[PDB]
Symmetry: C4
Subunit: 490 residues, 4 copies
Amino acid sequence: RQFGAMLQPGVNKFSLRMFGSQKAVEREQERVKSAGFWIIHPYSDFRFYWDLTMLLLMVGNLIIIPVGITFFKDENTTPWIVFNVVSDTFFLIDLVLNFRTGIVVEDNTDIILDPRRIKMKYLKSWFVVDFVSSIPVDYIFLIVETRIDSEVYKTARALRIVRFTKILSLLRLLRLSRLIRYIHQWEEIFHMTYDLASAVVRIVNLIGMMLLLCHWDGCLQFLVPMLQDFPDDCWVSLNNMVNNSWGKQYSYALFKAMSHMLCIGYGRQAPMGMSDVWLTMLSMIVGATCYAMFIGHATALIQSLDSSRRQYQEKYKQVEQYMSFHKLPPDTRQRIHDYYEHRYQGKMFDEESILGELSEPLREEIINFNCRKLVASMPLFANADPNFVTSMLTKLRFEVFQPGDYIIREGTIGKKMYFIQHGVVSVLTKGNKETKLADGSYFGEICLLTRGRRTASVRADTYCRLYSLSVDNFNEVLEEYPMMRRAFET
Amino acid sequence: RQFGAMLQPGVNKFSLRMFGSQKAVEREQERVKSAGFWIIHPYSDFRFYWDLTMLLLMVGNLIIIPVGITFFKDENTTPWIVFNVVSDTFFLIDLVLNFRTGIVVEDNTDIILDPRRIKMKYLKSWFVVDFVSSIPVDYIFLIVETRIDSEVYKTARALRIVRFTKILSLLRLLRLSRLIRYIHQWEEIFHMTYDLASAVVRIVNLIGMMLLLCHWDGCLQFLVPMLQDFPDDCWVSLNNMVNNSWGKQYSYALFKAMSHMLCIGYGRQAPMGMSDVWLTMLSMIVGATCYAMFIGHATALIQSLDSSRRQYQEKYKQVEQYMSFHKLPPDTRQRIHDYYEHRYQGKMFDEESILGELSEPLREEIINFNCRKLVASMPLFANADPNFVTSMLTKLRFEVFQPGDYIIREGTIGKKMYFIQHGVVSVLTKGNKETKLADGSYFGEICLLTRGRRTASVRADTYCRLYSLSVDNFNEVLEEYPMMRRAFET
Amino acid sequence: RQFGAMLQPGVNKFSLRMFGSQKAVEREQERVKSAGFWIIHPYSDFRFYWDLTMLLLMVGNLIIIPVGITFFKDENTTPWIVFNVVSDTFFLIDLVLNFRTGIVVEDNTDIILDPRRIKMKYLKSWFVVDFVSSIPVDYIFLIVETRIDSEVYKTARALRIVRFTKILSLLRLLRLSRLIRYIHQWEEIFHMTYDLASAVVRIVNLIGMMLLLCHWDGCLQFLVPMLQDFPDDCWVSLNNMVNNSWGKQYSYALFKAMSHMLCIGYGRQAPMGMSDVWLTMLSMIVGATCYAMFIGHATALIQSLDSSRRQYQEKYKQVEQYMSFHKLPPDTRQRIHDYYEHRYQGKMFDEESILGELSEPLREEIINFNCRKLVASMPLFANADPNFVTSMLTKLRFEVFQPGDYIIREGTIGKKMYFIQHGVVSVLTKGNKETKLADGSYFGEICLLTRGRRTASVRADTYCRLYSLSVDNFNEVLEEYPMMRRAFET
Amino acid sequence: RQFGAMLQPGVNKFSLRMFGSQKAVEREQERVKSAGFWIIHPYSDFRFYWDLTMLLLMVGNLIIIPVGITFFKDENTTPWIVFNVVSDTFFLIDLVLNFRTGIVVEDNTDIILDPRRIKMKYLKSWFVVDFVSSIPVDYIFLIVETRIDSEVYKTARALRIVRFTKILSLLRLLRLSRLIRYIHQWEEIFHMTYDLASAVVRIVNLIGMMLLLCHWDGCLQFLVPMLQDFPDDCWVSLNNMVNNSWGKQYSYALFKAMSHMLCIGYGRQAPMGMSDVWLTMLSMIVGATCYAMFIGHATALIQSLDSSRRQYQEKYKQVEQYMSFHKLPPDTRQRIHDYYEHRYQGKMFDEESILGELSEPLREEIINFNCRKLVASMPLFANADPNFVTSMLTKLRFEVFQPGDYIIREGTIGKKMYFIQHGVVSVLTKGNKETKLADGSYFGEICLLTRGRRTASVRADTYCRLYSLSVDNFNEVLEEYPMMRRAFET
């Protein structure tokens, strides 16, 4: 009874992350607990360990089945039959426990209590191939022949029947369907892989798929000549590899299939019999098409890694052509380039969209973390309450000046007041000699309470990073807060 | 007379879909019925079955003509002449009924009653090649020779004349023009294919076109050596395939042409005579260029299948670089990632454009289906009339909070009221212990009629999916409806 | 004197198009006539015919020079020296008249009267290579040897000197610089080619460039073995092509170079001497890199032909994922698909940008051509003056309803009035039986003068294409026109 | 002591550019001068010359190590040991001075005074491979064998031990890690290379990397047969290259590796022993995959050079489909094309974004340089002060009319006044005969002070480039300046 608890998802970094909170974990735990009979939750640690063992089984079979069919004349030995029957039992349990399982759609739990509803969905999608690739069809074929024909050994049928055994045993490698199914599942369901698109994981997927195609192709290149008992014009009988060892035969047939794949050649020579020509042609067209598609795939998947730099390069070419179209002096043309490279750093983003997409809690977390220590330094705001403070902070603006600008103009209208955030400025006066501010200071206070002319003029001494604060936004926030609208006059 | 009714489009899932309503079907039915003489409507079931038979004919001819020209020495037998003449009659009827047909431009009916207007358009576009590829030009050439030269058998001309027969019979495979024409027509005119761009259909189109080019190339590789009567340096005479059977000759010449196409080799060896070198060169350059273009095509057509996921990946890289550029704590950096993955689910869309593109009926169908049961639950709105209801519902906003947010802040200005749509929240009070709402409830009613301070503060206990409802939009809709503007005070 | 008039641009479809008006043609005619000495205007018919003859010369030389150097032992005959000297005279006149010519930058006339200013620019860019590839350097080398060495025939130097003649005569094929220069000039300066990017022209450019590289590569593959006098391990001496004819030698060396280019093989065999290995390696790497770059080029240039359809496919995938994310009934999911396919027709555009980019004259030409006959049909507007009419028409909106919509709702607020433009609607009333309007009618008049409730309700009977006309835009235009603001009340 | 000054960055075009101002240069100079012990600033001329010498060393070793291992039987001579020990000393100093160095992150100085903090970061990243590739591991292996085994010469171990010496000496070519590290550093840190993405530099990087892979592959193809002492089926022993010279052996093994890379063939023949087959297979798959990835890379990097022209082509195809969708007369369809080609010149930009991205100083520099001489020409503005002038100039608009437009309409409302900037217009009157203005004039003055009807109507006689100036923007700027609001009435 207590072992029936692993069949429901638990507290685990993967479940916790994909759910968000332990409360959500127990939530589904109960959503499954709506069940009467044991239903496997797809995220239940049981099914994860199941699928791990079954991934090992599927890979072992897809690698070992063809090599055992084609090479190893008289393949039935005391082992390899234990192997096929153990694999068949595991995959039959896979077939059964496949009906009684939790499906997931849209990341929304689809656990379907109705066995028929899950059974119907499985029947539609994959139960047919899983059935055809679960039962040892070759063994039941051999059986319905051994009983019917006593003279099978004496008759030519047994040779036909051994050829049919070797051909029908090839069904077992439709389990590639389950392999790709469970891999896609436990890679997109997997979160640490769902991130970045995991170009490493995806390209290793692709390398594995090409290597498997090439290895099955090699075993095929050797199966088809063998079935016809090595005619005098099959490569196995011109390369004189009839009496060789299964290592050399496999290695060289894999050589041929990989030649055809990369379009580098045929092998030691060019096909000479009709079976060779048609196999070479099928393998050339399939291998070369698949390889070129895989490489177009990986090329696009790599050139999608520098997207946010290609986009900055494009936006700067547009700035270049605007500058040209107005024929700007090559002094301003250099100031502009400096400013761009020192604002977008070879990577584009948008502090307006990327804040119109976030929710209000996240908007406020970023805004607060940015402007807290800055706006808290002023006395006229730090004394107010968080309502007014963090309803004002949403009017701040980002600004990246350049060494030499007149962030303020002497004796001029100062409609906005600035809050510095980085770099260092130097306020200037005709009378006063020098003064500086940096890394969290604030200037321009003479403008907020009353409008007039600025008593100074500051200069960016390095790449300052001020935070703007206008007055129209100010008094719009202000008229919402009469409480502090009254007290500012004094 | 009654059979002249199939020449006009009818009620049919394809016609119904491409027209929209049975009224539109009878509409055109009459637009064609503007005719006096039988005019084929391009969508008339007659022309569809016509084009089906003619597609079968064109494919049969493009596959059977070259193989019959090149191989089969003394090709004229009791069959194959019946074949050419039946094909010629069908294609001549195609030529005639091609003038008297309905053309379609922009999906706007172009049925042109004026025979001259349709005849002139056909003359301009394709009547010339269809004429050159309809009449058995080789037969009339042979005839204007048999009568003129009695000593044709005795003279060397007959050998010249049999070579010219075999060359001029090659015109019949300009019907590829009609094949691609009718396929493009009955694939874009076809709607279930016009959807998704039908990558399956398009890639099968491309595979068919490459296979046809490669098969014509094989027949050419064998035609050109044969015409010169197998010189001692043509592959047919070094591979010792003069006395072979037409199956082996075809299979191996197709082998060579496919080698040249994929750039895997020449064949058994490298060309040795000048005709071989120049054929191999023409075939190499044409095959390799065409194959590489087809594969660039299919690569782009496959990488256009994950567009709406590549675009989410790009937008998230921009969020990454915004986060970096402000150096956010790796707690907020994780909250943001969670929110994104749980709002755009690896697929981008825009509920603002995708509603500014739809018409007003569809805007209202989506808005209604979304917010009906939600806004109907409140008593203060369900009692009003659809005018006010569905003129208000256009101010609702979508919002996806995160487990732990303070969707409401305790004792704070509640300028907007929320309508929940999913998940589950938990209102909280200092005095009250607990309370919940979920899956279609509504809270925040104390704010609409009168403005003040919220008596509570709620928390997202899971990934809530509330629907916002402000008050400025509210009273803007309200001042449009004085009827309910008066009654809300009580 | 009168022949000095062709040196200035004239009235011609190319000049007329690239200038806009015959007044602009005479404008520049005078801008050049600012000259004292004959200056060639780059668009002067003289320079166009010049460049045509010179394009013929450059192509003839790039094809004939290598074939004459490598093959044709003892190449100096009574012809071919006339050929080199005529080509040298034409190209020297090209060098001279290259200084005295009109340059063009930004499509802004750059005709520079100052000979020094044009001379300085030419010196910087291309005068150096044009000088090195104009004078017969091999002839002056031969001359400074014939005079210095009487025993040249007797000495081994003459063999060295004939090798140096054959190598130094290779300079003449730097005229490829001029070829690509003049082609880019007379293709982008050319307008009918500057359109569409002329994918045909550009891909033929690329095919020509690959064919030229491959042909020079063939001549090189034959030059380098020959210079060493056919060592016993050069392909020319294993393929036994020493005593062959220049046709076979050229054809097969071009074969080899094209093999290396496409990466299909080497030739009859694989290199065996060190010169062969290093030539084959240089040619493999250069040919294969260049070919793959050309094909990436042409692939992108073809996949840039269906841009405005790929973009519709992307926008519709985003509509698909919006529909999914709200789980819409598969009835609305089909209405939406119908509307999209019947509004954007598989091709995206933006009637807002494409009207914010045009000038005001073009804005008014399109707006007028669209809405003239429609707005003129109403009596209350046709009686007003073009000022009010065409200041109102800028408030019209485009709208594509769908068979079955209630374009008007019965007894409802009709804030906008519609002008039909296509399709056919059917107004409905409880009392009135039926009525129709189509293809240029207008309805909804009861709303403009006075606001109330609509006395009817219309339905889209086919895919109507109405033109909206609101009342807020109406009275905003109205308050600008008091003249007609007064008279509407009656 | 004074030599300890080069260890800090100085005044230099690279430092000056990457910092912005000499004040910033001395700023960091002091930020480093926060140090007590000599710390290498990564931009210190010392480290730049260091890295130059070390780049020379790394390239020399990556080219000379493999060629010395594989060929040159009995490689230990009086030279080459001096070479390995000098290289080892330089690279060990690299290892030591690697701990005591300035790191840079985000272009923000990361100079870390704490030796442990820099040491810890280096330990994490690359100290491990740099240690494994710094010490002569093969020499210490040989030493711990020479002392232990006196009978090493007599025993079979010495042959094992010479094979292990030749294998373990291969560690030294992990310095490719440092090579790519220092190249990426001194190419992105390098600014003149960081511009344009420097497609030239990047493609030369890629060509160098492919050439190095191919050269190591050649040396490997020769190392692996040699270690097994040239079995009777290694290409070195079928191509009969055992007794050859190291030049021929190297050149032909590089031939083979480059064959496998481009997928052109194997070599003189196809592998025959198991070591040959497996090397050829490893080299085929690695070389072909890497080459195809490099070429996808370079293709995308070249097709990213015409981005701002591809984007204009796309925007114009959208204009084409808008024109079609409204079926415009092919006169307007030509006017529109002329206007586009003469406004966006085959290159797109956005004078609104590209001015919303710039700071306020740069906004004002471009605006001033554009409109200074234009707005200064008018008397009513030039007499005002820069405050009003340059607060007005931000309302100017750009506009490109077309020869024949009525920039003004006769006797019409002239809500905007124009400032010409290029081309030439011709004002017209019923009474007045003719008049012109061009290249910096100004017209439309009768409208600003008082509103009425224009007394004239002008025409674009060429492609004018006026600068618009509305009146609503005018009086909005005006009500901000009462000073000049009063004086305009007179």
